[PDB]
Design a protein around this ligand. Sequence first.
Ligand SMILES: [Fe+2]
Length: 675
Amino acid sequence: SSHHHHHYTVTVATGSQEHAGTDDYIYLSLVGSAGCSEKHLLDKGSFERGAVDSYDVTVDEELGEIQLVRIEKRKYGSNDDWYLKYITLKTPHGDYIEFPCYRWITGDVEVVLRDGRAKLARDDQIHILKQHRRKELETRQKQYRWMEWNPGFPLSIDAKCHKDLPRDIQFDSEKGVDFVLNYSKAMENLFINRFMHMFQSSWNDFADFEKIFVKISNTISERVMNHWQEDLMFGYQFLNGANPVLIRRCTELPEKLPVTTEMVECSLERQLSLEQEVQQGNIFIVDFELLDGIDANKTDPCTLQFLAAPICLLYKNLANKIVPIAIQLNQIPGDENPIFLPSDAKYDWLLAKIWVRSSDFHVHQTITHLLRTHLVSEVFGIAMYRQLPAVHPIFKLLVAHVRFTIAINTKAREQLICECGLFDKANATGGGGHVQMVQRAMKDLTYASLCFPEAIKARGMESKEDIPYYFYRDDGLLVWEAIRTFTAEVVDIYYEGDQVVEEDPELQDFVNDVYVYGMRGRKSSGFPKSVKSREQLSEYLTVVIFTASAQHAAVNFGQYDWASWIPNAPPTMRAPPPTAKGVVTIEQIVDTLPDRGRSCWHLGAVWALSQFQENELFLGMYPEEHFIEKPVKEAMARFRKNLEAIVSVIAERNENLQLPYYYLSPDRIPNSVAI
Ligand SMILES: [Fe+2]
């Protein structure tokens, strides 16, 4: 695809996208320490998609060391956008200089690119480079401003629809990544259009839903189908499901749950008492205080949707497996909030489990998944684009991990979770309830909650010896330390010491745009207002990236496996929680379960949101060479080797498991949060 033009040897790399070529005029200038260059007109032929064009440009006079490159595109007619990858120069004196672009040029502005050697402001001392940097930040801050989408929410990009973002942060495709289009296209692909708007109609039994499900089911999905009524599967999801972040070891029984040793005698397997067992550390808890006060979806007057705020008490049996031993569906005990038990009627216990699952699904969708992953990543991205110039070593590193984050969130807000959005179709927290969740969850979000080892230890889930079957933790720690090592290497490459980090003005303003605008300047978040050490900078970028890639994928890509069997992850409930024991029948649960119309939308949503791209970039795949220097390439190479080793470790582990756990295998962890 190489084309040579003959009258400095200039090589321009055009993008591989479906539209990266442009037929407009492209003029080029070389800005040197001893002079500037005329606007040289490139070939008249249109730059092609995936192209690499070479041109001979003769300078009238010695320009000295080439520092900057101006690129202008003037429309020949009907101006179309052009994705520039990089520009290489082979100078007369025998020097090869690479300028990474990787940006959309739509004629609107003249783009100015700098050498691919990563630089800190402290390194720049001449008017040429400094003016470029200052002006670059001026326009970055003109282009990337903050906005509050909903009160108490983290600040997001200033835009109403997708087309309102800078194209550099838009999707490569016009309508390529669309919630409406991909969800409906799945509902057709999954062969479920007949139920797309078939509300107020209930599935007559499990068998009917099962016959449609077998043809679309997966491995983990079919296991869920065969084992969703088992205490073992119920407890297993609390460690290795799609939302394995809520369980905490119980060191003292909550006073609000008046559970008794005599109540759990049958589940207990050590001849110890319930309190004695808590003293031993074998009792675990999942408390849904965050669902108390959430308003259920009232958008459908012909169906009442209901939430709960359960407290689930679980036990680690002689097999070192965590299984549920007690469930109270609401927060304040009484005569109408029974504590259901595995000894109760089959369907009392089953309905308790169904409600616990529904609550976990609501938390996952809103708190675990959206807020703590997407919106955090978007905050980091907006701060990045505002405060770190493209020549900064932190920008070159994070740009690949915040790719498609702003755009996916904006598309969500314009199609998915807006007022009367697709979210309200099947979820009971539509109409505003989920909004309140985020607000209430905000004050619980802290910088330590995003640091993985601290987060694991904070709930007491640290000991692999006492809690051996926590694969999510085991893989997460491997990946976290891998990324920490990679980030440490980069930091050490670019910061002589803590003084250089501390004196870095653009890093500090980036951190502060995260603290003030991202977290709203809330003191109780724990976010650094300034980084003064390389260990702290490493940890900060580690939080950023791990939230943007590994954690996000762990919370997203278990949705079709585990939520696909609706009884295992109900998006809504159509009856209030049972207030008495021995009064509920399997039929009544089927009637409490979602209708046929919401079924299709939930299934399509989890399937569409559970998808990898055909040419997706996984952890370490950095095709866009923003870094072009040798030491940083070696650091990336080591990153890749350690990741591949972890892939081997995780595969060998999966070979000996009932149900393998592949979500934290780096070969399935994208770079950024694109869904
Ligand atoms: Fe996600």
